């Protein structure tokens, strides 16, 4: 048959809006900004945003709309060579689906722990609390070994933090069941009712932002909000010399915008050919970076309040890693009237933000993979088995991040698997093929015939120069001034862990050069003609059903 289109223009936006607005906004951005000093994170953040994040995102959407194909076959239509971008995106999204559901596992654990008379992380008098812990209020009344009850609950119970990655400890069975419960939710929403949230689009979309306004209002009114915003906004120039801030902020754009995954291309392939997706992406792009920036005020206002209460530096008040959103926001809900009621709403909001995203990415790779075998899959019970196998295998690998030493594996996956040099590798090759091989001006003829008008030269230069320079320059300068990954600024990773971590990056990076080798080997003839035949697009806009022109 043919790839079914969206039922309406509104269906495309809500699916895309919930597909890349989520834990990448309210969870990953706050601690990446917190890790890389304060406001020095924002200059690379906005530079990468307006240089490549919007351009590459629109490029993927427009490629999907042009080819009417998924993550992988879109590149096959665009360019038979460099078709390994699809497989690299599939590997990246596979690892992302492996490690991104652990955040929802932790969120479910907090949601379950929240159904009590008193929130467990308000006061530290429980079994897991070390004798060093004491309350934030009486911290000033009472060196540098006095931990707060909030960090204790996250480390010494929820995580049961192990001394290192090479001490995995014992699997946390409570978190494994929470990990299975969210995976069962995704499976039961992917197999039946691929897009079944249409009845409650009003609540399932507006509430996550409605809660974000509530947290923002509470955060700004706190006594210590002044120092937090100055920490969040005012940049430190000396930190711009470290290449890590450019890598972190550079790939936080690519992470938050879900590009180089094949989900955007799949989402962009489900809309009409004669649909103006240029304007909607910019409005959708504004919603993402607006959410990350505005919610950044909320969490960083809490950090200033926490630092003021404890009388410690803002940079030393919480965890410089994943779990800042789990240390700041659960502290914010404590100061609210009826703390239990709001804490339930926050972690329900946190769940709805990521569940909608996980639905898109999991379906993105499933749709991308079934394109490889349209006959073997997408027919009867063979999709039932295949989707479960993807979810079951990806769940078992997620168990390694649930054990007591599971946090350290989480930082490895977070830094390497679906972020960092792997994203800079695919994003560079996405733009390099389009701008220099396919032709930036050559694609504009398709886009102008598609949205009805020719957009400005912003996209042309971003793919041609800005994105390759930003990707290549940051890739080179990261290795030149190499710094090993660390967890919470203290833990130094063992050599094999970094070697394992680089395998996660190289597992998808090596897809691009490999597929070139197979493509060259399969093609018969002289080497130059072999290459020349493999760069000719195979009629990407082969859809006479919708009015169109010739691709060349």
As a whole number of angstroms, the distance between CA 440 and CA 465 comes to 11
Least distance CB 488 / ligand D10 (angstroms)? 27
243-272 residues near Na ion, rule: CB under 5 A: 256
Q: Measured from the CB atom, is 284 or 421 closer to ligand CCCCCCCCCCCC?
A: 421
Least distance (Å) from Cl ion to the CB of residue 58? 16
Q: Which C-beta is closer to ligand CCCCCCCC: that of 295 or that of 541?
A: 295
Residue selected from 12, 13, 16, 24 as contacting Na ion according to rule CB under 5 A: 24
Determine the size of the site formed for ligand D10 (CB under 6 A).
Answer: 7
Name the binder of 369 from Na ion, Cl ion, ligand D10, none, CB < 5-8 A by kind.
Answer: ligand D10
Distance CA 441, CA 466 (A): 16
Which residue has its beta carbon closest to Na ion? 256
CA distance to 238, 247, 443, per residue, from 33 (Å): 15, 12, 35
Phi, psi of 150, rounded to the nearest 5 degrees: -70, -50
Q: Which does 312 bind (CB under 5 to 8 A by kind): ligand CCCCCCCCCCCC, ligand CCCCCCCC, Na ion, none?
A: none
In sequence order, the 6+-apart residues with CB closer than 8 A to the CB of 184 are none
Residues 6+ apart with CB under 8 A from 162: 168, 169, 403, 404, 405, 407, 408
340, 119 in Cβ contact below 8 A?
yes
Number of residues that bind ligand CCCCCCCC (CB under 6 A): 13
The region of 66-74, 246-254, 393-401, 485-493 touching ligand D10 under the rule CB under 6 A is 393-401
The two tokens of residue 96 are 């992302």
Among 98, 161, 401, 409, the residue binding ligand D10 under the rule CB under 6 A is 98
Helices 511-522, 495-509: inter-axial angle, 10-degree rounding = 40
- Determine phi and psi for 327, rounding to 5 degrees: -115, -30
CB of 522 to ligand CCCCCCCCCCCC, least distance (A): 8
Alpha helices in 260-336 (DSSP H): 263-268, 277-310, 325-335
Which positions lie near ligand CCCCCCCCCCCC, rule CB under 6 A?
87, 91, 507, 511, 514-515, 518
Residue 369 in contact with ligand D10, rule: CB under 6 A: yes
Number of neighbouring beta carbons within 10 Å of residue 230: 14
Binding at 22: pick from Na ion, Cl ion, ligand CCCCCCCCCCCC, none (beta carbon under 5-8 Å per type)? Na ion
Residue placing its CB nearer to ligand D10 in the complex, 388 or 397: 397
291 part of the interface to ligand CCCCCCCC, by CB under 6 A: yes
CB of 502 to Cl ion, least distance (A): 25
For ligand D10, give the closer residue by CB, 94 or 148. 94
Residue 295 lies near Cl ion (rule: CB under 5 A): no
User: Does 502 participate in binding ligand CCCCCCCC (rule CB under 6 A)?
Assistant: no
Contact 339, 71 (CB under 8 A): no
Stretch that binds Na ion, among 53-61, 113-121, 347-355, 414-422 (CB under 5 A): 347-355
Please give the Cα distance from 186 to 191 (Å, whole number).
9
d(CA 63, CA 74): 7
Q: Binds 292, which of ligand CCCCCCCCCCCC, ligand CCCCCCCC, Cl ion, none (CB < 5 to 8 A, cut-off by type)?
A: Cl ion
Contact 225, 305 (CB under 8 A): yes
Give the C-alpha distances (Å, rounded to integers) separating 361 from 400, 412, 427: 21, 20, 17
Q: Note whether 256 binds Cl ion by CB under 5 A.
A: yes
- DSSP secondary-structure letter at 6? P
Q: Is 357 in the site for Cl ion (CB under 5 A)?
A: no
Q: Please give the structure tokens belonging to residue 60.
A: 């993927």
* Least gap, CB of 341 to ligand D10 (angstroms): 38
For position 22 contacting Na ion by CB under 5 A, the verdict is: yes
What minimum distance in Å lies between the beta carbon of 137 and ligand CCCCCCCC?
A: 29
Size of the site for Na ion (CB under 5 A): 9
CA distance 100 to 414: 8
- Of 243, 256, 252, the residue nearest 473 (C-alpha): 243
Contacting ligand CCCCCCCC within 193-212 (CB under 6 A): 209, 212
CB of 470 vs ligand CCCCCCCC, minimal distance in Å: 23
Q: Which does residue 256 bind out of ligand CCCCCCCC, ligand CCCCCCCCCCCC, Cl ion, none, counting CB within 5 to 8 angstroms by kind?
A: Cl ion
Cβ proximity to ligand CCCCCCCCCCCC: between 91 and 158 the closer is 91
Q: Are 424 and 474 in contact (CB under 8 A)?
A: yes
* Cα 172 → chain centroid: 25
Cβ distance to ligand D10 smaller for residue 458 or 502: 502
Strands 491-492 vs 486-487: parallel, antiparallel or unpaired: antiparallel
Map tokens 């999907």 to a residue. 64
91 binds, among Cl ion, ligand D10, ligand CCCCCCCC, none (CB under 5 to 8 A by kind): ligand CCCCCCCC
Q: What is the spatial distance between Cα 288 and Cα 294, in angstroms, rounded to a whole number?
A: 10
Please state, as a whole number, how many other Cβ atoms lie within 10 Å of the Cβ of residue 210: 12
Binding site for Cl ion (CB under 5 A): 29, 256, 292
Q: Would you tell me which residues interact with Na ion (CB under 5 A)?
A: 18, 20, 22, 24-25, 256, 353, 356-357
**Binding interface with ligand D10 (CB under 6 A):** 94, 98, 369, 390, 393-394, 397
């Amino acid at each position: 048959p043919q790839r079914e289109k969206w039922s309406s223009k509104i269906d495309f936006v809500l699916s895309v809006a919930g597909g890349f607005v989520g834990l990448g906004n309210v969870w990953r951005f706050p601690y990446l900004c917190y890790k890389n000093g304060g406001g020095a994170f924002l200059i690379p953040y906005f530079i990468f945003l307006f240089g490549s994040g919007l351009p590459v995102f629109f490029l993927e959407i427009i490629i999907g709309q042009y080819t009417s194909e998924g993550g992988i076959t879109c590149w096959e239509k665009i360019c038979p060579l460099f078709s390994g971008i699809g497989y690299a995106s599939v590997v990246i999204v596979s690892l992302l689906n492996v490690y991104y559901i652990v955040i929802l596992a932790w969120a479910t654990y907090y949601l379950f722990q929240s159904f009590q008379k008193e929130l467990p992380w308000a006061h530290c008098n429980h079994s897991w609390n070390t004798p060093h812990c004491m309350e934030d209020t009486m911290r000033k009344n009472k060196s540098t070994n006095f931990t707060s009850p909030v960090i204790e609950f996250w480390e010494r119970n929820v995580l049961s933090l192990s001394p290192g990655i090479d001490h995995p400890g014992s699997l946390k069975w409570d978190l494994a069941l929470c990990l299975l419960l969210v995976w069962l939710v995704c499976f039961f929403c992917i197999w039946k009712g691929v897009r079944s949230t249409g009845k409650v689009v009003y609540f399932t979309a507006t509430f996550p932002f409605a809660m974000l306004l509530v947290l923002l209002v509470r955060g700004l009114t706190l006594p210590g909000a002044g120092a937090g915003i100055k920490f969040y906004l005012y940049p430190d120039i000396t930190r711009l010399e470290d290449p890590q801030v450019w890598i972190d902020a550079g790939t936080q754009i690519f992470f938050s915008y879900a590009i180089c995954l094949g989900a955007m291309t799949s989402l962009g392939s489900y809309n009409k050919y004669k649909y103006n997706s240029y304007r909607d992406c910019m409005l959708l792009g504004c919603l993402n970076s607006g959410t990350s920036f505005v919610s950044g005020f909320a969490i960083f206002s809490i950090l200033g309040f926490m630092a003021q209460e404890q009388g410690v530096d803002i940079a030393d008040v919480a965890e410089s890693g994943p779990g800042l959103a789990f240390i700041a926001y659960p502290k914010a809900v404590t100061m609210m009237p009826l703390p239990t009621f709001w804490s339930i709403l926050f972690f329900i909001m946190l769940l709805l933000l990521g569940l909608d995203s996980q639905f898109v990415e999991v379906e993105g790779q499933i749709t991308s993979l079934v394109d490889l075998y349209p006959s073997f899959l997408r027919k009867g019970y063979r999709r039932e088995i295949f989707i479960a196998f993807v979810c079951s295998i990806s769940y078992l690998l997620g168990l390694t991040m649930v054990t007591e030493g599971g946090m350290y594996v989480f930082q490895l996956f977070d830094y390497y698997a679906a972020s960092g040099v792997c994203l800079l590798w695919v994003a560079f090759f996405e733009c390099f093929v389009i701008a220099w091989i396919y032709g930036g001006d050559n694609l504009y003829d398709g886009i102008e015939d598609m949205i009805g008008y020719r957009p400005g030269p912003w996209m042309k230069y971003s793919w041609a120069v800005i994105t390759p320079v930003l990707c290549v320059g940051c890739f080179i300068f990261s290795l030149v001034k190499y710094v090993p990954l660390t967890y919470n600024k203290t833990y130094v990773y063992p050599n094999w862990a970094i070697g394992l971590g680089w395998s996660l990056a190289l597992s998808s990076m090596l897809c691009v050069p490999l597929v070139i080798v197979i493509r060259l080997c399969q093609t018969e003839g002289p080497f130059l003609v072999r290459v020349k035949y493999l760069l000719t697009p195979r009629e990407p806009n082969r859809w006479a059903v919708e009015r169109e022109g010739a691709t060349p």
